[PDB]
Design a binder for this molecule. Structure first.
Ligand SMILES: O=c1cc(-c2ccc(O)c(O)c2)oc2cccc(O)c12
Length: 115
């Protein structure tokens, strides 16, 4: 069935807002967050980070209707963004991008408060 419930539509719209956000110079900040590297590729991340998370995990939960509200999705984004900000240095760009997208997430939730 092609038609989404109101909640599915809202979930989808929040996700898409973070995925498609582009800054004033045309860069999609989400590109690096789509998929986390392997355990072999980033051993250090997996030793430090308790709950690994990337946007494909959030997308998979979403497409399996595993999020029953918007708060549950925000929780996983915040986890992802906090992980990036824990592992990477405060002066690094992935740290900074995670913060801008955190703002976009929240700004997108506020925009859609009525809907
Ligand atoms: O902290 C993260 C770091 C990386 C990452 C991606 C490509 C790289 O070349 C890298 O050095 C780190 O991907 C991620 C994807 C999702 C969530 C993350 O916190 C991360």
């Amino acid at each position: 069935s092609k038609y989404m419930t109101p909640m599915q539509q809202k979930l989808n719209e929040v996700y898409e807002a973070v995925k498609n956000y582009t800054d004033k110079r045309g860069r999609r900040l989400s590109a690096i967050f789509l998929r986390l590297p392997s355990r072999s590729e980033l051993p250090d991340y997996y030793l430090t980070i308790k709950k690994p998370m990337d946007m494909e995990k959030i997308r998979s939960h979403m497409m399996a209707n595993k999020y029953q509200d918007i708060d549950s999705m925000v929780e996983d984004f915040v986890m992802m963004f906090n992980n990036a900000c824990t592992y990477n240095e405060p002066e690094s760009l992935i740290y900074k991008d995670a913060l801008v997208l955190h703002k976009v997430l929240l700004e997108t939730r506020r925009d859609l408060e009525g809907d």
